[PDB]
């Protein structure tokens, strides 16, 4: 039987070189699964507490504290439970911690176990992770949202918008879809060389040049698309993570490209681009708690584009429900480590999906070699994934895993294609 | 490995005493699963072709024809395939048949194999059917929609509306929820005795008295609710399957309670009841192809009540998509045998769920001892099921299986309760 | 038994976003191993032929050609052989190709199989890859040579020397050793910020600022070491890959920092630094075929520093033997993909090790999520590894795997420390 | 799993008829391995303490004392440990003893367990001992150094030099190599008969005639080579173990063939022979602690011949390191029982091999039916073995095991041939 028999945990380095939690689970039937926990550069206020060691080591960013929680407290608590009772294991961890924000054991320890338990469950079931999580109907390969020009907090550059990504919605398959993104990325490299701009990479592996403004970046991407013999829009669409939390002052407003601006001021600018450019998606265009601004933007342009809530929802059913009720955004960015457990994440997906909202499975600035979200994207049938550029193997590894799932699925597999966005 | 090794099929009797298809699947690892196929009394035009033998036997309702298709054609075609590649097995069956409406091998043969393969997959995975189909997050026990007064085609009575059902939305758990329905049903029995009306059962095990009109029935149910020491609405809500296809004349209109009436005429009457009674759901209030009428009813009262499409969608993504586009209804009645495969069914659920529509897993007038839909309701997290009265074990068996799933889930389990209907 | 039963191969993306070969091997005992093949940005002339597709796809850098070789030719050839007869499998592949430079099937296909077969062997033996390859005595954790400032071909910058790396020789353990490098890297980030220089990353995840000269870079690294509260030399030493092939003109000489210079000219400059800075290692200081220059440099400063042959030996026993005979260099850079097989690599290690030469296991500019070389470094007991910065998970993943091996080894484990370099 | 479950030990007779330690190890997975411990006639001062019983039995040479140590102390200490964690098991034994020279439990008990554990590890891994110890690259069959004329302490004759051996360096394979030695040995038998000299065997199974001097012996061997239709040098080379410890007086000098002589006196004589005869190797030409003499001999003739350290290094990394530093000898004679553990032995090999020194795996005057060193020679890829004459099955058994390894390896196998000695 798949009965949890051993829970070990160790400290490893994420893609930025910062420590994080890796968890290992053994079942009485000799199953061995391993899950590693990502970390965002700038984390939203309402995220689950990341338990850091503090002090001298790794500039206080150590997670030995979180590792001992797993060995000392969680292991003893879940050992004896059944690995395929995810909700019961997840509820035990949540109850063991006993805090709203998972501040006792840490979301990074809690999730470490949540994910490792899920992988062990699927190995023991002799099912690939996407098939076990999403059932036998898991088959929709997602549109890669590939962040090829990096700004905001993932770059030490003076670019305001955090992510500029390409969406090969026109591709007939994932294998072609991934080729297109790759081929556009390499094109952009040459474009940036031609214009004498920087090709040093940011955190998610996009190029980090000191472009003048938002227009200028999108123009360079469009060039790159065309240079790669693809048509902007129909073949390859555009997307943003504005991340307007990281350039919003509590109460005051948004300090954005010279002029400190209102949500309505901003809302006009975003509408402008929908005109100029082939944008299918805009994420965190306004601040985490600027609830008024989002409703107006959503009311204004929601018919015309996909609006993705990241820091406003922090993958939280509580925050998401308020959103749905107030008609804030049409899509949820899904980040396991924001909420802290797999079941809390899927509850969030389920709420969004039942509320007619789309979902986009997301990585963090600090990723590991873990490919968990690759399977999660297909399992939940989101048809959209944001796991960074076609550069840096903490991003690429997910795309490689998506290739494998597509292979495994054979004729069963369908690429979400342009069906991901009605508008 | 879970590789299909043997496919046998035989003819059995459904709950009406009519033959139907039962399928058995063996995997190379010695897994043995069995699935039986239901049949509706009056089937919608756009349903999958049920392959009947014709001739003298069982008044032409034999399925020996369909049984040989399984032995002779399907067995040889799927043997060697992997049981947990549901979509690949389902696609092979669909391609082998090679017709739009599954008229070659018959939906009843095709589905027989589709479901048996799915059950074998789950046994081999050592997972309960709901866990394998819906993943580890399957936990939402559905609200039983219990049809305790039978009219229309399930009764040889002069009652116009086909189904009158009770919805114990107020119950804290499924185990209590099922008790309430049972206790209300037995109360209604005594009420009908008191009023000297009939307690002979219809097809779905509801009482089939010759009540004057629609009002009169709902009044008797309300009595019964109150007599059982429960509060109508808050504890126990009301629901209908109008089945207005079975009393609509192509082009003319709806011959309903004396007066042949327009969709707008009808629409006024339905709105009337929402006022008089605590209705959470109304199903097939207008005809299968009366596309104009549904839009007006949906526009009119859709804010005020759940509108369920049965014969208008026949569990067909094609028909459902047109509905969503034309804003026809807010919920899909899910019937595996209308569409013909498990994967086609789940595609339909997925379309509805992504379009912000609710889903209600449904039985047929002709049911078997099969409890498949009990698991399917929890797997898809619909939170609503219509599997008939708390009488006749072709209905009860599903409720017994729902009790078992609730047990298995323990603290994980949550009863959909009043969360199934916002309004 | 561990008898090769299935060989599958697919095309994936390396860390630059370029396609490469991934191979999967199944044994009759149901073992499943996967190995992925790296690729260097600028490859030495004498490396094994990388079989590229050419044409439009991935700017001609596709490897579908190589994938079919595996499926069509290699699979049929090795299936039936014993996975733990590495030399026999490797010899079969070499003979099947039948060319000096592996130009028929491609080193990238050949090696794909060589490595996958080795991993399957170790799984079947129930041994970690390092234990199976290096026997029960494999225990020496290597000194991480961490390339934290990137120039040459891994950067679109005007820096002449390709790699600037830090060597935490003073650390008591790998776990501390990796912390030091990480902590120094993050320090350098802050230093570069302070000096207003670029922190956009190069191919191996080092910072790619447009530093004036070689001195200036080494000075910034030393700052960073000191800023991290470690002592340059005793705690953290310095190392270079000059990669003088990529700035040498056939017959003419080396175009290096303004002045086109002789091997003797260069040799004086390198000796200068040994004075100024705490350098333990200098790699490819002169050109691949500049055999005369290396002897003089080796004669001149070989007593004073470790000289590492990369492109001069291309992991080739043939090239290495000439070197040993002519007393060219004191160390071999080991790259599996230069030579094409695991056994050819180990022959090369064995020649070097028996000739009193040290060995440094190396990655490529294009790496995958594969951690194979992490195990290989410990198995061969080199005590030195170059797998890039503590940034980008195609580098970090190896360091994470080295942490795991150190854990597994417990008290058995010894960190090579300052014992890696006598001088 | 390969977890040590039982350690039994018993007293057996070596090839001289003296008791020694035999150890048996059982793993929880029902693996059964047996290792027997050799003993040298005259042991170097710096060897590990051989724990002898003393008293009446076997003239005090009993090892019941050592057997009880295994049963009473070591068994309980290592039971529960993992057999393939050699270094951890070896370190436990070393720590349990807790003395520099293994004088508490005895090297003969300690090693008994060290070797038995290693064999059990390899059985459980389902790998031949050479493959498990040396990894998949173990393939180099060693040159047999066959001691066919015995003097010194292995003979009750008046011959000064201890070993006169033949080296079939010219052979194309081990199977031919062993034939040549055998055929030369039988030839020497006939030569000795012709000259009316003795053919009674010494301890290692070489002929023990009372030859006049060192020249006279080498002349008889050369005759024998030629009589066997092989060419001295190119086909069959010559080698000595001078064993100058057993004819050196502390402080005074070496009493050798009439004249008590200086290290420089001796050094001239050895140089003389290199001229007269085809010698590839000379072992313990000077005394164990005569550190000055070895440096001069090594400086003098080290370019011209292989110098093997036996009693000077006693297979001790400590003693070997001093040697390497002082440039004493170019090769290490490897004897497991001198150092006391397999891991301490391999550390010694590793030091020598990384210092550019060759290694020769050696037996003892007192050998058992054990063939362990046959595998060890191939695992460490020494390409040289000294396991005595082609007579007496305590020698021959090793050659028979080398034949089997060569068979197993097939085309993988390479005979070290004349590649063992550059000079
Ligand atoms: O803004 C976001 O969506 C994420 C990137 O996936 O940012 P961070 O990981 O820094 O929280
Ligand atoms: O109208 C319906 O929903 C069904 C009852 O489940 O009717 P029939 O089975 O007769 O098609
Ligand atoms: O020069 C080197 O050693 C390598 C980096 O490991 O370079 P490339 O991978 O580009 O050949
Ligand atoms: O001198 C030696 O090398 C050995 C023989 O292998 O001698 P003894 O076994 O007597 O120590
Ligand atoms: Mg954001
Ligand atoms: Mg109906
Ligand atoms: Mg180089
Ligand atoms: Mg000796």
Residue numbers in the entry:
A (entry chain A), B (entry chain A), C (entry chain A), D (entry chain A): 1 to 423
What does the original paper state about this entry?
Enolase, a ubiquitous enzyme, catalyzes the reversible conversion of 2-phospho­glycerate (2PG) to phospho­enolpyruvate (PEP) in the glycolytic pathway of organisms of all three domains of life. Here we present structural snapshots of Mycobacterium tuberculosis (Mtb) enolase in apo, PEP-bound and two 2PG-bound forms as it catalyzes the conversion of PEP to 2PG. MtEno has a topology similar to other enolase structures, a smaller N-terminal domain and a larger C-terminal domain. The crystal and the cryoEM structures (enzyme in solution, frozen) along with the biochemical studies clearly demonstrate that the functional unit of MtEno is an octamer.
Tautomerization resonance is accelerated on acidification of the carboxyl group of 2PG which is accomplished through its lone-pair-mediated coordination with both the Mg2+ ions and the transfer of a proton from His154 onto the nearest oxygen linked to the phosphate moiety. To find out if the exact reverse of this reaction occurs during the conversion of PEP to 2PG, we systematically mutated each of the residues Ser42, Asp241, Glu163, Glu204 and Lys335 to alanine, compared their activity with wild type MtEno, and elucidated the structures of three of them [Figs. 4(a) and 4(b)]. Notably, the K335A mutation disrupts the nucleophilic (proton) substitution, the E204A mutation defuncts enolation capacity, D241A should make the MgA 2+ coordination in the active site highly improbable and S42A should absolve the MgB 2+ coordination. We analyzed the solvent accessibility in the protein structure based on tunnels and channels buried in the core of the protein by employing CAVER. The water-accessibility channel tunnel of the MtEno S42A–2PG co-crystal structure was similar to that of MtEno Wt-2PG [Figs. 4(d) and 4(e)], corroborating our annotation of the substrate being 2PG. On the other hand, MgB 2+ was absent, possibly owing to the role of Ser42 in MgB 2+ coordination. However, conversion of PEP to 2PG even in its absence indicated that MgB 2+ may be non-obligatory for the reverse reaction. Moreover, the activity of MtEno–S42A is considerably reduced (∼5% of MtEno WT enzyme) but not completely abolished unlike other mutant enzymes which were non-functional [Fig. 4(b)]. Based on these results, it is plausible that, while MgB 2+ aids in the tautomerization, the presence of MgA 2+ makes its presence partially redundant.
